[PDB]
Amino acid sequence: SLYPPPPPYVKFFTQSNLEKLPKYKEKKAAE
Amino acid sequence: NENGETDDNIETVMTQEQFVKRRRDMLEHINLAMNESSLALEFVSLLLSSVKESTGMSSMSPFLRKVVKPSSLNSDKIPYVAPTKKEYIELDILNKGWKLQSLNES
Amino acid sequence: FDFNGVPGQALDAVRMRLAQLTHSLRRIRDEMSKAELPQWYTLQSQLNVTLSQLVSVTSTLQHFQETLDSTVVYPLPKFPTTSHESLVTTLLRKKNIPEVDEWMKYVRETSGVTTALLKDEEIEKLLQQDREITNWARTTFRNEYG
Amino acid sequence: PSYSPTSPSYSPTSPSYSPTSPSYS
Amino acid sequence: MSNQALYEKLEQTRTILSVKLAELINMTTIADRNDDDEGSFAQENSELAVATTSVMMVNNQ
Amino acid sequence: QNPLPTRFEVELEFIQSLANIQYVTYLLTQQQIWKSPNFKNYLKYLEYWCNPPYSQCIVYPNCLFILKLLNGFMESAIVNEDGLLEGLDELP
Amino acid sequence: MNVTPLDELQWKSPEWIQVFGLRTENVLDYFAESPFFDKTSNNQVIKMQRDPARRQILFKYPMYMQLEEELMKLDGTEYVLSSVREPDFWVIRKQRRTNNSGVGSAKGPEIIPLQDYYIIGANIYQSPTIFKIVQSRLMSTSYHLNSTLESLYDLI
Secondary structure, eight states: OOSOOOOGGGGGOOHHHHHHHHHHHHHHHOO | OHHHHHHHTTOOOOOSSHHHHHHHHHHHHHHHHHHHHHHHHHHHHHHOSSHHHHHHHTTSHHHHTOOOOOOOOOOOHHHHHHHHHSHHHHHHHHHHHHHHHHHHHO | OOSOOOOOTTHHHHHHHHHHHHHHHHHHHHHHHOTTSOOOHHHHHHHHHHHHHHHHHHHHHHHHTHHHHHHHOOOOOOOGGGTTTTTHHHHHTOOOOOTHHHHHHHHHTTSSOSSSOTHHHHHHHHHHHHHHHHHHHHHHHHHHHO | OOSSSOOOOOOSSSSOSOOOOOOOO | OHHHHHHHHHHHHHHHHHHHHHHHHHHHHHTOOOOSSSSOOOOOOSHHHHHHHHHHHHHHO | OOOOOOHHHHHHHHHHHTTSHHHHHHHHTOSHHHHSTHHHHHHHHGGGGGSTTGGGGOSOTHHHHHHHHHHHHHHHOOBOSSSOBGGGTTOO | OOOOOSSOOBOOSTTTTTOOSSTHHHHHHHHHHSOOOSHHHHHHHHHHHOOOHHHHHHOOOSTHHHHHHHHHHHSOEEETTEEEOSSEEEEEEETTEEEEEEEEEOOOTTOOOEEEEEEEEETTEEEOOOTTHHHHHHHHHHHHHHHHHHHHTOOO
16 A cells, blocks of 8 residues: 555544634644 | 346346445344344243243343243233224324325335 | 343234244345355345235334333343353444445435524425325326226 | 244344444543 | 137236236335334334345345 | 654645545545544534635635535535435435 | 434443443433433432332332432322322333333222333433334335346346
8 A cells, every 4th residue: 555644643633622623723822 | 028027027236335335234134024023033031931932032142041931911901992082093094195205205 | 029120012023023034034044145056036036025025014013112212222131141242242232334334425415404403404304294295196196097 | 833843044144234323432 | 729828828917907006106115114103004013034035025026 | 864753744635636627525524534524524624724824825826615505515515324424415 | 314213222321421320320311312302300409409010120220219209299290199290200120221201100909000101211322112113113114125136037
């Protein structure tokens, strides 16, 4: 399979992390 | 005419790969339903509760090695009502006209 | 007295017809493998024609206690022996549809309907009934065959 | 007495009956 | 002799008569014919098996 | 030789590979990646490329269109139990 | 928009940190199944806001037994020698795994039945199923596959 797999970063895209995102983005505002 | 209708009724064919692959299709596609009728024989062990139930149960060799009488139910005659009375159930009867239509198209 | 009389009234009745459809399929399955020779086109229709009949009785046996059984709806609790080897339990207690549900959609979408609701839908019912009444016309024509 | 013994086939390798969507917290 | 041979043919004819009728009549039932009237005695209830009547009709009739 | 790609570089390369219909197919008819919402969620996250300044880096414009299609499809796409994408079962 | 409908997965690892080991198990199930709708949770929130024949067969051992009293208190239509409940959720278990139901009890001197939903719970997963629904399953499957078989009789 010379077709690559999706980027390793995919594992982080859980529904639990998605829920935590809005608050995290806020807190951040305060490589 | 009769001989020729009997010829078509002799399965007869001289096909290479053509005849070969087709009969393999029968094997697998028939086998599937054979095997799924065996889930049907597993509902048999599901009875348990009776000696005649054990008889039905031994139907699986794995039942021969999975001793338990295992399962139990309650009452949702209400849920029978929901199955029958739902707007979904009225609608589903439309799946009856729909499949039946495509069957008539066939 | 410890535990309960749960369900399964006509369960025996389902099992019997569940078996006959199993038994007729299984035997056809065994032969299906000796593709060395197919049994005589008479023979296969005798086995595959009463093998389909077997599933009519098995089809109907399901509806006859059809109120009773979907109502019963038992999910399993057992010996923890069932818990080891796991899946067998997921497998053996599971209802679904196969790749099957898909040509069920092909068929459903093949009809002329889908999201337009109740009033227009009740009307379609009366119309299909009119089709069945125009089918009675078959009764009239059958008299002619006389 | 329908036939004699009962035809095994038991299977967990089949297509599949379970889906999956509540994995996320 | 000839008689016995014919009897079979007559039976076959009767069979041929009785099944375009079942294809027509079962068409009604296959299309699903749920009745507000309680007296009517044709059933198409359960999912698989009531549209299975449609798959069996096809092959049978 | 160059060092290993950056995340930005990895994602730009990856979104652009979706411009190849065969490859997108090979994914759509995978099994594992549709069991969990991760990949589905990743593709929606990637729509960050559809706007400036990001989009100004896209050499293969089709990948944006296909991402959009691919995405809208997924929302209403029914996922079989194994991972099989239901609405595609008939096709190879 | 795809539904998981007739029970599917768990909620897993997320109250594996909060820890599952009976009694706490029931509450973990609540988050997981997305199936505590009224009474059990309602009982939970009000505090959080600031036998039977089957029960005799069951017999409760530890703190969940105390909760049981509370739940009866929450939901009990009362008759002369009888009590009936509205929407309580509850459990039966062993060792690695158990099974729980959310039910309505009707009582009497010589008989008592709870009508409910029953859910089994092993390793972060819930099972809720129906016979007759159960049948339609591999039954329609058997037949669609038999008609693949019948379609294959496209042989001369």
